[PDB]
Design a protein around this nucleic acid. Structure first.
Ligand SMILES: [Mg+2]
Ligand SMILES: [Mg+2]
Ligand SMILES: [Mg+2]
Lengths: 289, 293
DNA sequence: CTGACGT
DNA sequence: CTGACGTGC
DNA sequence: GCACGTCAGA
DNA sequence: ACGTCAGAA
C-alpha cells in the first residue's frame, strides 16, 4: 500500500513490437538488450531499398534515454543494426524501422560489413532449407582477466549520451523445417567479438551452449520452447558454413549491378583484380537488355 | 508466421515485493537495480535482531542468476544491503528478507560501515521530523575519462557468478510531512563513490539533480510523483547533515559496551574511546551497569 | 549501527 | 550485402 | 546542418 | 552455527 504510494521505479525493459522485429531497450546503455526477428523466404524478397532510409532516434523512446546520430558520427564506430535491413525487403516500413537507433549498437566497421554480415547472409540462406527462422541478436559486455588476476568488465562509451560499445555480439538462431514437419528444431547460439574477423575462423568456433549465453547475458531466450521437444544443434543438422572470399566478393558484386551508370566495368575490373572467376552473373544483360 | 511464436526473451526485471521493501533484480550483474523502501517512526522501533539473521540467496531468484555467499566471502568486498536491517526493527520477517542476496551489492567495507551507514542513520532521523519517508537505493557503474580522451566503463566482477562491483551507489529520498498536510514534499538524490569516505565531505557534496541520476541510471524514480507541483529541496527544508566523528564514535561505543562479554573487552572499549575525549551520561550509566561483571 | 572471522 | 564520407544547396 | 553521390569491405 | 572483533586523525 504505502510502499508503492508513488509507484515503483521504471526500468523500461518492456518488449516493443515493430513491423518485423521486436526488441527490449536498455535505457542506461542506450542500446537494445535483445532484438527478435523472424525470417522467411517471402520476407527477404521485395523492392524495399535502404537508400531511401536513414538512421534516426526511435520516437517511442523517451529522448533522455535515446541515442542520437551525433553519438555515432565521428566516434570511430559504425551503426550496427541487430535486425538487418536485408531481412525486410518485403516492406518499406519494416526496413525503415530497422534504422531506428533502438535497433543499433556501436559496431566495428570491418565486423559489421564483413564477418557479421556473412552471418546475416547465412541466416537468410537458412530460409532456403527451413520455412521459418527466428533470430535473437544483441550486445554483450563480457569480463576479461586483469594483470593482477581479478576479473573486470570494461567497455567504451561514446558521445554525449555515453552509448555503450559492446565487446561482443550474440546471435541465437532457431529454425523450423516446416509447420507440419515432425523433424526436430535446429538451434544455435553464437558469440562474436566486436572486432575485425577474417575468413579463416569458422562459425562453429564462435558457438556456445544456450545455457552459457543465458548466464552471460542475464536473459532466457525462447521461453515458450518445449524443453523435451527434440532440438538439435544447428551445426549438426545444417552446415553453419559462411561464404568464403570468392563467394562473398562474387555475391557483393552481383548486388552492385543495381547501380546507375556504366561504372560496371570498374566493378568488373575489381572482380579480375581479386581474380574471381566468371560466374554466370547474367544479371549484366538483364540489367542492360 | 508469428514473431512471438516461442515467446519474447525474458529479462527478469519485474518488481519483487517483500514485507517492507521491493526491488528489481539485474540477472546479468547479480545485483538489484533498485530497492524501494518506506520507513516511519514505528518501523524503526522493535525487537528484531540481526544477530538472528543470515545472508542467503533469495529463494525466489532463479539459481542461474542468483548470487551466492561464495561470491562475496574473501573477495575483499562486503555484502552491502540496499534496504538496511536497521529500517526493519518492527518485523523479524521483514529484516530477514533484507539479508536475501537480491538486496545485496558488493560494497567497500569502510563505506559500508561508515559513510553509507551514516546516510542510513540520517534517513531514520528524518522520521523524527517527517511522518513518512521513501528511499530508493541501488548500484551504479559510471564511466571515467582516460588520458587519451575516450570514456570507459570499468567494474570488477567477483566470484564464479561474476557479481558486478559498482563504482558508485545512489540513494533517492522522498519525505512527506504528513498525509493530511499541504506542505510540499521533500526530495533529495545522492551519488557516492563505492570507496572509503571520511567525515569531511558533507552529504550535500554528493547531491545530484534527480534528472541527472535518472539519465545516469536509466531509471525513472517515483513515476506517480507529481513533479509538476512544488517539490522542496530536502537539503534546504532539512539539514542533510550526517553525524560527525564525535557523535558517531560515541554512538558505536555505547552499543559496543552492551556486547562486552569479557571484562578485558569492556576495558579495551574504554581506551579506544578516550582518544576523542568523549564522556556522555547514558554511556556513563551503561558502562557501570556492565562493568561490575 | 554496519559488517567480518575463528572453533 | 554492410556501412561511412565527402559535397552543396 | 541534413539530404544525395561516391567509395569501401582480407 | 555461534561468541568475538572493528569502524578518520
Ligand atoms: Mg551491420
Ligand atoms: Mg551496509
Ligand atoms: Mg526545498
Amino acid at each position: 500500500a504505502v510502499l508503492e504510494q508513488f509507484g515503483f521505479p521504471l526500468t523500461g525493459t518492456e518488449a516493443r513490437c515493430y513491423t518485423n522485429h521486436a526488441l527490449s531497450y536498455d535505457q542506461a546503455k542506450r542500446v537494445p538488450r535483445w532484438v527478435l526477428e523472424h525470417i522467411s523466404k517471402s520476407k527477404i524478397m521485395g523492392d524495399a531499398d535502404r537508400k531511401h532510409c536513414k538512421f534516426k532516434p526511435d520516437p517511442n523512446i523517451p529522448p533522455t534515454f535515446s541515442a542520437f546520430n551525433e553519438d555515432y558520427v565521428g566516434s570511430g564506430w559504425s551503426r550496427g543494426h541487430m535486425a538487418p535491413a536485408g531481412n525486410n525487403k518485403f516492406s518499406s516500413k519494416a526496413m525503415a524501422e530497422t534504422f531506428y537507433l533502438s535497433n543499433i549498437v556501436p559496431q566495428d566497421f570491418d565486423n559489421n560489413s564483413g564477418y557479421w554480415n556473412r552471418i546475416e547472409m547465412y541466416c537468410r540462406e537458412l530460409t532456403e532449407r527451413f520455412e521459418d527462422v527466428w533470430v535473437v541478436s544483441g550486445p554483450l559486455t563480457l569480463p576479461q582477466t586483469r594483470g593482477d588476476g581479478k576479473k573486470i568488465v570494461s567497455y567504451q562509451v561514446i558521445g554525449e549520451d555515453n552509448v555503450a560499445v559492446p565487446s561482443h555480439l550474440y546471435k541465437v538462431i532457431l529454425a523450423r523445417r516446416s509447420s507440419v514437419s515432425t523433424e526436430p528444431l535446429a538451434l544455435g547460439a553464437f558469440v562474436v567479438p566486436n572486432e575485425a574477423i577474417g575468413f579463416q575462423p569458422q562459425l562453429t568456433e564462435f558457438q556456445v551452449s544456450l545455457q552459457d549465453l543465458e548466464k552471460l547475458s542475464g536473459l532466457v531466450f525462447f521461453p515458450h520452447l518445449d524443453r523435451t521437444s527434440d532440438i538439435r544443434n544447428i551445426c549438426s543438422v545444417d552446415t553453419c558454413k559462411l561464404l568464403d572470399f570468392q563467394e562473398f566478393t562474387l555475391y557483393l558484386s552481383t548486388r552492385k549491378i543495381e547501380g546507375a551508370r556504366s561504372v560496371l566495368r570498374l566493378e568488373k575490373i575489381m572482380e579480375n583484380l581479386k581474380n574471381a572467376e566468371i560466374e554466370p552473373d547474367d544479371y549484366f544483360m538483364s540489367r542492360y537488355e
